Copies of this chain bind each other. A is one copy, B any other.
Amino acid sequence: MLHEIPKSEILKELKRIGAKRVLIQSPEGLRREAEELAGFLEENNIEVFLHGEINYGACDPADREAKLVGCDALIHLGHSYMKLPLEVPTIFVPAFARVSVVEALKENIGEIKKLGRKIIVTTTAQHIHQLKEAKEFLESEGFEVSIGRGDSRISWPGQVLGCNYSVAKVRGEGILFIGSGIFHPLGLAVATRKKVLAIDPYTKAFSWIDPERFIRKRWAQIAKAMDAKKFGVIVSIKKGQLRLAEAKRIVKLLKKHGREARLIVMNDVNYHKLEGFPFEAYVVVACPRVPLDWRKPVLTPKEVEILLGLREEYEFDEILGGPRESDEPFGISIHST
């Protein structure tokens, strides 16, 4: 369960810009909420279109789509703004989980002490509004809590994304991750080379990350691709995911190492669409969680650098930004370019 959508404040903002037609995108967990909000915005004399795509991140604003169907503004549900040009005014509506992370921490004090005294703390957007609490709880348990600001991909200090761990590139003895799943903790472990403890707030269960099984798993993908002469190098037109330059360099780099390479342009990168092409292996230069989560081997940019013998240590593929001057609000935000 989440905190309820702030329907009133969104309309107050929409009324401020006198928007008449709005497109609302939403991720898989907020489909019922999207229509729920559309009914409320229509009840206040505003036309609403729902974006039928399943959204995966603020890296994919549907602003262009909003323009093509003549919407004044864009409502983006469930994610916080990351730095992007926006062709229409966009209201970002972050989702905040109500679960108590301090309760989850108090259950696992013993495990956290194993990380060290000075510890780096990280969480995902659903728990970011409780990061102040967790810091205060940990400091009251003798910890020095180090939280990184992160870069322009990131909306709040201490926030991680599947594609970015800049908040964890600060001084510290170990990393605590507050959230569900193992991809973020795995990525933190690989990216920082530090011990990572992952605590799931919904179950209070904990997890000591060991990336070796994941890295071995990836190396078989690399080894399987070692015999391939025909590579496809994939970009995504999603605005915060397009990495044309880097993809071109991978193409150039493969050709310069006796391989054939073709740049491939997609929106949603999914293998099922590629099965007819003649390529023997693939490199995704987009959302890193796509190859890291296909009947032919699919590699990240870093991994193809390893395959070519230009890099030795394994590296998570991250999309970085530059410096971020200010922090997104713990609430709805509105941006335009």
Binding site for B on A (CB under 8 A): 23, 28-29, 31-32, 34-35, 38-39, 48-54, 62, 65, 68-70, 232, 234-235, 237, 242, 244, 260, 262-267, 269, 273-279
Contacts and interface: CB of A to CB of B under 8 A. Distances in A.
A263 B267 CA distance: 22
Given A70-B244, A234-B52, A32 B266 contact: no
A152 to B, nearest CB: 21
A237 B69 contact: yes
A273 B50 contact: no
Contacts of A29: 276
Contact of A28 (B48, B264, B265, B276): B276
A242 B234 CA distance: 27
A266 B48 contact: no
Contacts of A52: 232, 234, 264-266, 269, 273-274
Contacts of A53: 266-267, 273
Contact of A276 (B32, B48, B62, B260): B32
A232 B50 CA distance: 9
A84 B70 CA distance: 19
A51 B265 CA distance: 5
A193 B269 CA distance: 43
10 contacts: A23-B265, A29-B276, A49-B262, A49-B263, A50-B232, A52-B265, A52-B273, A52-B274, A65-B265, A69-B237
Nearest to A235: B69
Nearest to A272: B54
Contacts of A34: 277
Contact of A264 (B50, B264, B267): B50
Given A50-B262, A264-B50, A265-B52, A277 B31 contact: yes
Given A28-B276, A31-B277, A244-B70, A50 B263 contact: yes
Contact of A273 (B54, B70, B266): B54
Contact of A32 (B54, B70, B260, B278): B278
Nearest to A255: B42
A35 B277 CA distance: 7
A260 to B, nearest CB: 8
A297 to B, nearest CB: 17
A244 to B, nearest CB: 6
A277 B27 CA distance: 11
A34 B273 CA distance: 13
A38 B232 CA distance: 12
Nearest to A29: B276
Nearest to A236: B52
Contacts of A273: 52-54
Nearest first, the 8 A-B pairs at minimum CB distance are: A31-B276, A52-B266, A52-B264, A49-B263, A50-B264, A31-B277, A49-B265, A54-B273
